[PDB]
Amino acid sequence: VPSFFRWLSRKYPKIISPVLEEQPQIVDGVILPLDYSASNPNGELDNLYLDMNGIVHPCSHPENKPPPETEDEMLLAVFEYTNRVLNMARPRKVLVMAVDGVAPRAKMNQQRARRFRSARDAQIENEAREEIMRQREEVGEIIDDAVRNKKTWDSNAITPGTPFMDKLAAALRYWTAFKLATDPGWKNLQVIISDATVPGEGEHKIMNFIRSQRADPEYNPNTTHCIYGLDADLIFLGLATHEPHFKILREDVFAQDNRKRNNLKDTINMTEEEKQFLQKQNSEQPFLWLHINVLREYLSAELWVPGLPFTFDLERAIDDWVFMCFFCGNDFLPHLPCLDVRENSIDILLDIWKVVLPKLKTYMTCDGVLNLPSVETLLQHLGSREGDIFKTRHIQEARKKEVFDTDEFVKLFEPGYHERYYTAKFHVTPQDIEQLRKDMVKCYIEGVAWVLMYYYQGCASWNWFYPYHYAPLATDFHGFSHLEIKFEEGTPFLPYEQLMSVLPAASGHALPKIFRSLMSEPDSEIIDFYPEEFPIDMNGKKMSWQGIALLPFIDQDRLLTAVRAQYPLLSDAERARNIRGEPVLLISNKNANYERFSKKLYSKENNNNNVVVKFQHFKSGLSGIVSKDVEGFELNGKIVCPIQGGSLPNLSTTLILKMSYRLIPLPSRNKSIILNGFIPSEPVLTAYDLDSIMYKYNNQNYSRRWNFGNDLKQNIVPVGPKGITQYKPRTGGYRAFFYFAELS
Amino acid sequence: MFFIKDLSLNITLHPSFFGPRMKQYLKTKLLEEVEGSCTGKFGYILCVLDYDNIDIQRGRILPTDGSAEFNVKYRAVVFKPFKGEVVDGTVVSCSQHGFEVQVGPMKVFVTKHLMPQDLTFNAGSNPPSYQSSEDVITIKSRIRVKIEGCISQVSSIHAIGSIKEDYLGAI
Amino acid sequence: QYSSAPLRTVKEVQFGLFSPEEVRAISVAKIRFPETMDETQTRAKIGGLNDPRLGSIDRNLKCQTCQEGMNECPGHFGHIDLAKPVFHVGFIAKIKKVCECVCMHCGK
Amino acid sequence: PKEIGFYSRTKDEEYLISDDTNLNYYYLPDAELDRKLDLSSGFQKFKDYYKDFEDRCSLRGLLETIESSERHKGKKINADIITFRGIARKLISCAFDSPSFNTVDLRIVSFNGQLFIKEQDLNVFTGYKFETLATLSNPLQYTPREVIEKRTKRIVSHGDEYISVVRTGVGNCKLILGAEVDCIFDFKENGRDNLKHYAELKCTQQVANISDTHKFERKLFRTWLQCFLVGIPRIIYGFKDDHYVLKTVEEFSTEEVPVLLKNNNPQVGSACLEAIKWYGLLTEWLLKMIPRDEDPHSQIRAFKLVFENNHLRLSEIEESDEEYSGLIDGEHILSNGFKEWRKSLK
Amino acid sequence: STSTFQTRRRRLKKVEEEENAATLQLGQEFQLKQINHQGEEEELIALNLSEARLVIKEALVERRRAFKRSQKKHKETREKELESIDVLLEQTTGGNNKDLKNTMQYLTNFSRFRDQETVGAVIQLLKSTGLHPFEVAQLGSLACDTADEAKTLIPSLNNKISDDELERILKELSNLETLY
Amino acid sequence: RNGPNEHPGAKYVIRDSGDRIDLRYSKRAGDIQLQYGWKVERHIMDNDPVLFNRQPSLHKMSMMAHRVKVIPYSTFRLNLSVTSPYNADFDGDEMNLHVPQSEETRAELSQL
Amino acid sequence: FLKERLMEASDAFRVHICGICGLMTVIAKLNHNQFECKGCDNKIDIYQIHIPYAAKLLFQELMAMNITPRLYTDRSRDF
Amino acid sequence: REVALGKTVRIRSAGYKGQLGIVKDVNGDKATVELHSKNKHITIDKHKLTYYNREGGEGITYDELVNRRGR
Amino acid sequence: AIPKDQRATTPYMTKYERARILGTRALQISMNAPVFVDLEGETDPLRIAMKELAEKKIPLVIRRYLPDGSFEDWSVEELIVDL
RNA sequence: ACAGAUGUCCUCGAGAGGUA
Ligand SMILES: [Mg+2]
Ligand SMILES: [Mg+2]
Ligand SMILES: [Mg+2]
Ligand SMILES: [Zn+2]
Ligand SMILES: [Zn+2]
DSSP: OOHHHHHHHHHOOTTEEEOOOOOOOEETTEEOOOOSSSOOTTOOOOEEEEETHHHHHHHSSOSSOOOOSSHHHHHHHHHHHHHHHHHHHOOSSEEEEEOOOOOOHHHHHHHHHHHHHHHHHHHHHHHHHHHHHHHHHHHTOOOOHHHHHOOOOOGGGOOTTSHHHHHHHHHHHHHHHHHHHHOGGGSSOEEEEEOTTSOSOSSHHHHHHHHHHTSSTTOOTTOOEEEEOSOTHHHHHGGGGOOSSEEEEEEOHHHHTTOOOOOGGGGGTSTHHHHHHHHHHHTOOOEEEEESHHHHHHHHHHSOOSOOSSOOOHHHHHHHHHHHHHHHSOTTSOOOSSOSSSSHHHHHHHHHHHHHTTTOSSOSEETTEEOHHHHHHHHHHHHHHHHHHHHHHHHHHHHHHOOBOOHHHHOTTSSOHHHHHHHTTSOSOHHHHHHHHHHHHHHHHHHHHHHHHHHHHOOSOSSOOOOOSSOOOSSOOOSOTTOOOOOOOOOOOOHHHHHHHHOOOTTOOOSOHHHHHHHHSSSOTTGGGOOSSOOOOBOSSSOGGGOBOOOOOOOHHHHHHHHHHHSTTSOHHHHGGGOOOOOEEEEOTTOTTHHHHHHHSSSTTOOOSOOOEEEOSSSSSOOEEEEOOOSSOOTTOEEOOTTSTTOOOOEETTSOEEEEEEOOOOSSOOOOOOOTTOOOOOOOOOHHHHHHHHSOOSGGGGSSOOSSSOGGGGOOOOOSOOOSOSSOOOSOOTHHHHHHHHHO | OOEEEOOEEEEEEOGGGOSTTHHHHHHHHHHHHHTTOEETTTEEEEEEOOTTTOBOOOOEEOSSSSOEEEEEEOOEEEEOOOSSEEEEEEEEEEOSSOEEEEOSSOOBBOOTTTSOSSOEEEOOSSSOEEEETTEEOOSSOEEEEEEOOOOOOSSSOOOBEEOOSTTOSOO | OOOOSOBOOOOEEEOOBOOHHHHHHHOSOBOOOOOSSTBTTTBOOTTSTTOGGGOOOSTTOOBTTTTBOSTTOOOOOOBOOOSSOOOOGGGHHHHHHHHHHSOSSSOO | OEEEEEEEEOGGGOOEESOOSOOOBBOOOHHHHHTTOBSOSOGGGOEEOSTTOSOTTOOHHHHHHHHHHHHHSSSOOSOOEEEOSSHHHHHHHTTTSOGGGSOOOEEEEOGGGSEEEEOOHHHHHHHHHHHHHTBOSSOTTSSOHHHHHHTTTOOOEEOOEEEEEEEEEETTEEEEEEEEEOEEOSOOOTTSOOTTTEEEEEEEEOOOSHHHHHHHHHHHHHHHHHHHTTTOOEEEEEEEOTTOBEEEEEEEETTTHHHHHHTSOHHHHHHHHHHHHHHHHHHHHHHHHOOOOOSSSOOOOEEEEEEETTEEEEEEOOTTSHHHIIIIITOSSOOHHHHHHHHHHO | OOSSOOOSSOTTOOSOSOOOOSSOOOOSSSOSSBOOSSSSOBOOOOOOHHHHHHHHHHHHHHHHHHHHHHHHHHOOTHHHHHHHHHHHHTTTTOSOOHHHHHHHHHHHHTOSOOSHHHHHHHHHHHTTSOOOHHHHHHHHHSOOSSHHHHHHHSOSOTTOOOOHHHHHHHHHHHHHHHTO | OOOSSSSSSEEEEEOSSSOEEETTTSOTTOOOOOOTTOEEEEOOOTTOEEEEEOSSOOSGGGEEEEEOOOOSSSSOOOOGGGHHHHTOOSSSOOOEEEOOOSHHHHHHHHHO | OHHIIIIITTOOEEEEEETTTOSSOOEEETTTTEEEBTTTTBSSOEEEEEEOHHHHHHHHHHHHTTBOOEEESSOGGGO | OOSOSSOEEEOOSGGGTTOEEEEEEEETTEEEEEOSSSSOEEEEETTTSEEOOSSOOOOBOTTHHHHTSOO | OOOTTOOOSOSBOOHHHHHHHHHHHHHHHHSSOOOOSOOSSOOOHHHHHHHHHHTTOOOOEEEEEOSSSOEEEEESTTSBOOO
């Protein structure tokens, strides 16, 4: 269990809810196929969004049993995992499948380092295994070369643009077509596929899709949404969507912290009994719910401030909270030295905001736009307060105490660390200290603005990068009250450009012959950007893999020249994958809009591949723009199964309709306003919980063990609309008078 | 095949409804509870007849709390999947596993080793169906199914059917 | 806690002996290894005297047989397959008396 | 109920045709309700354009949109009675309340067979301010946050009202009404009927006892009758107090208000049936002896209807009356377009 | 939920008998001569598929007139049958009762007999034999052509060997079902 | 509102669901709204029937139900005529006290 | 009062008893609403009773002593 | 969070004027302050009682919230 | 079995019966349950129970079990309360 | 892609000295 999960469970305990996973009955050896049209015990669900990376990644190269066969085993595992998730959630309106693709230049800074660290770990473990076999062979035993050559799955090879992504995308389409054809309950379900060709990080695609579904006047505000992902920030990102009917599904990491991890050798000691018990135990994986509707009430009861010149708005209150949480920690910028734990600093930042809010005469952020003087005052107050936090952290570290090593020599607890911290990154020169401080201030402000725009109003630069490795220390951004931030739109990177900007190590061989020849040659124009020994590992507090790299950045112009030089001699078949592509929408044979789609597109009109159809959410759902498919799909045809050894029956094209889906362009800026006609959920909170969250509780102090206990006693929480009227009865009369009479 | 029985259900009425209309309260409770219940011992309680006839007895007040338990005596139509008989049903789903034949409020499943070897799965036609010589079953078709399943009555009942031997087809 | 089973009061208690078939059937695990916490002194050995299928031993780990902790787990029962039949200490006198009553060569 | 057409009547009284000049969209989160907004504001800053109106019951836009509908279509419709949502409401409601509460002045003309009938301050200003603060003109999702924040410190004006023609009738008798729609609650469909999506909002005082409950019941009866005469499915009421502060806003959908008055005192429960029967009897009396022109260019006469002593005294006036000259010949309620259309087909 | 008192050592009978097979061998609770609520010794009913539809329809209309008068005091072929059944079920039972629609549809689209006189004739014909009501219910529910087909589809019918009267009443059932 | 510190007050507020609220730890001086059907664990007040017993309990008069009267000293006080059935003196004797936890038990102790 | 002092005031336990066994060897899954007795294949004849924990310990020790204290919720006088 | 925690305080006014004790548990407005000479606990308002140094020194009122420190 | 109305127990209410009815009624009034008398300014459930029992307005039935197993039902209103 | 800690009560069999 992560520290963030523990923090959110301690501060907000009721957000943890139990799940109801159906177990199909087994009679006479056979397995009863579970129904899909039956009512879901976990409440009605309409929209489900799934990050396909979060399923294809754990299935491949797992920590218990690596797939012994070829990619086929991983494909079967991800197919059964997706089937289990679909049966658990049971979407009724639209099911969304998205996998990571092209990402903006800011993401390469940390993704490249993570991939290189993983590759180095794989290389060193392979060397250790080779040494183990060499020592074992000295005794006299003989091991087949197949076992020795049976290396890992090369997790670094899973990158957008590789043929593995294309093979996975081809398999996914067949799987969803088979599911739509063979399941009568999928008649109204609509499935979209966002392959690795489509740019996005997996979650930003979901944000764009939900803002495009909210880009229609007739969109129902009462629709429920579910997003499944293992990322910790996923539960936090869904709050920014301003959708009360939201809940996050994820695996129960509380049990998985100390789950079954015994060695395979012990599985044969007791023969049938122990193996049967083990296979029964791991067959069921508990999950949990991360409802956001309840969390909105907790945030409302925790962000209240008495006395304010402006008007307290719940929608605007969450904006400052999400901006501050992103500032404290995100996967786009280096961690602030002051905010390292990222858990205990949240309350300090919140009370700083509470004490500075009366001084300010305006809100923190306005629809993603950061108020420059207000944020300047906030960071000035934090820097004034950061001294006490730094002193307490140093005292705690000293009490606890009682690969380059850089932070140890800094000795931040001693007075005068302002230049001592910067000496670990640059030379000992006075004016250079000020120059680097100003540059870091400008870069950090630009990065904060860029991440706010990306997570609120979508991508705005697509090429911005962070040209630094160490975040500025406390009392930063002293004078910056004159800069104006205005980002420029840039074209997304090509799949090959993004793949080489990820910069896999020499172990990776997903590149074609030309690119690997241009790399492996000792006299390479970009050989300086590709280390071999990788000695850039550096601790900087923390431990284990949490250390960051210090390798030099990559110049975009050199990589562009390299790709433009390698392009002309590449084969046309391989170059055919350079197309950005568009998401593909799949609908059932008996869909409400199926007749209209079959009469408009792929019909007797026989237009020259330029007719598009725009439809609203009044009929069926999934508002958007559909276009002619660019693949080989055609009416009265057949689709070849790519799984091969999967015993999957072939299907015809008359059962599944395939077309290219394009999101509706945003007319105006995506504001944060609750849509009219939204029906609030049932009132579940009590004033006691409001007081509990208003008073500062030191993790409940373990006075009565209220943190952990009858967790299952919280039961399920009702979801969906509750009551025709969207306004709670306050004073008034008639209906409110009758309610008061029946209550009192 | 449906049976008319004389079942009994115990309802623990709360003292908050100990008024002149507690009888009608028990009546509506019995309706809202017994209907749609998939009891393992009996099956489905489709409907309760003679609503204005069912009688209640003196409710015994429990020693623990003031709630009173009433032993009602109702009669209703009960459907049980049973075992060892032929029955007619209508398909509602089809897949490689089998066809989901529906008889009344039931969904009897047929596995691979149940039907004879004269059925092969294919998706060439508009409905995904098992097609072979002189056998035509589809999403909506007539089929006679013989039940030989173990039911497995655990808070709900099920059924497994067979297609072996003649007369178990469309006809 | 809520249980869908009807709540009743015990009206009769029937005593009797335990047949080997019944105790074998109701048993949830078989105990053969005469060791406890033998999983490299980290976990409980499978098939030992502290088999996890018996029930929740400590902390808050739910018993895998019933997916619950201790506040509602009666405690599941195992069994031991004795190599040879063994007399019951409390029934020695009755066994001797019934052996004297009946013939030792025929069941008459 | 079927929609025939619509028109807009903004400032300068140009009576534009088939334009959604305002199409006010309702939007009011509960946070704004809890914000305790003030409905008084700039009372002296009100700009009323009704004073400069040339006619309170002017139907020039209705006549123009009827001409446009007839030009687009072929044969004329079977509806006879035409009312600008004011005569029908008063005629039905006068049988339920005292005649002193309503002023009767009706001018009925049978041109071309069809029938054309033409007829506190602080509370009114507070209601108009609430109406303006409960809408944002252009639909949400297409306006910046600046308009949202400016809506609080906005101005109040009397004009630019969206009016749509609704065709209805019971039995053989059919009639159309020039109903004015000031709010749309859901997505608006272009080229399709929007009656099922429209909504109406008003203001009312709170309740304190049974007498105030009966007053609220009477107001609900009035608004339900006025909506059912057109077909508005949604009714919105904004509660107000002695301090002119919006306390709570609740919506009253149709198909449930009749049962809500039924489960109340018998008077309000039977008021619905009494009003329905009175409307039916009034329509039957209206279709009794009014002359039918049939073919165009026929004799045209005007009638005067006065409701006194619980009786609709109707008399046939002579040509010597000044009103006859100003209507039959003066064409005060008619227009050159209608006579041109009448001469066009015959 | 039970209707019969404990007898014949129910506590520890272990496996008294295997579950019901094709060759009759009824269950412990569904045995003949059930205990009547008011008295005792009530035989199991002989209810067929067509009889079930009429019985449920009669119960539905009885409850319909019941709560219709209560609220008043307080204040083609298959296509026509489906609409009437839907409008009756929409408000009579209330609640959810999803399974009621499926069984009603099955009764309507598989109604062998659609007249009270027809079902009266068929059960007055079937009461002549001493067969188990389970056998007569299946015989009157599923139409059959040959004697061997009836024996195979409906087992535990070996007591009839003559097959002459069996052919006679099979033809009677066939013509009654075609007289719908 | 008084709290568990003053003698007239409560220590816990049992909710309808079953969760227990501790008025000592939570405190906050909050205006908690008590919905109907909830349970409040208040301190024993005057005229509260309790069971008063002495060991050994030879006869039925060795344990009888009294009425609670709160006194400002830490010792059980009883009438002199009551000691005779209890067979107790004031030379160091200690005697137990039992508090009923339900209405029917209180009524049974009061009437029997 | 005696029952309250013996059970509510000291220890109250809820257990499930098989209707055929009479013992407490019933696996209960309240979340899944499953009550199966593996000994008799019983899934529709499960009852719950309230007994003190001391009684539970005594019954378990007796069962360990090869003695079956079968518990039933009906009278056998009706035969 | 609360300043009045583990700091020696002197009770002012009431029947315990001039007494010396250490506050152990603080909740809401009432503060539970133990007594040195007397073996009892008295709950009084935190504002009423003055605040002293653990080692010894001048006494101050509840203005420690502004100072956010001791002494 | 029930002994018709040829009952032969005592036409009066025993002390144990009085205590049991008083406790049951006190619990029922303590919970949200209807009261069939005029509280008249009483707020203790036990006293409300005694007030209800004063004029025999308690809708409770006593089932006196014979040692053999038979039982006869006695209404509260028909039971004489002399103690 | 991802991921470093907490849940409140422990004795148990005995022995000795005393109080009603
Ligand atoms: Mg991420
Ligand atoms: Mg209005
Ligand atoms: Mg003494
Ligand atoms: Zn267990
Ligand atoms: Zn059993």
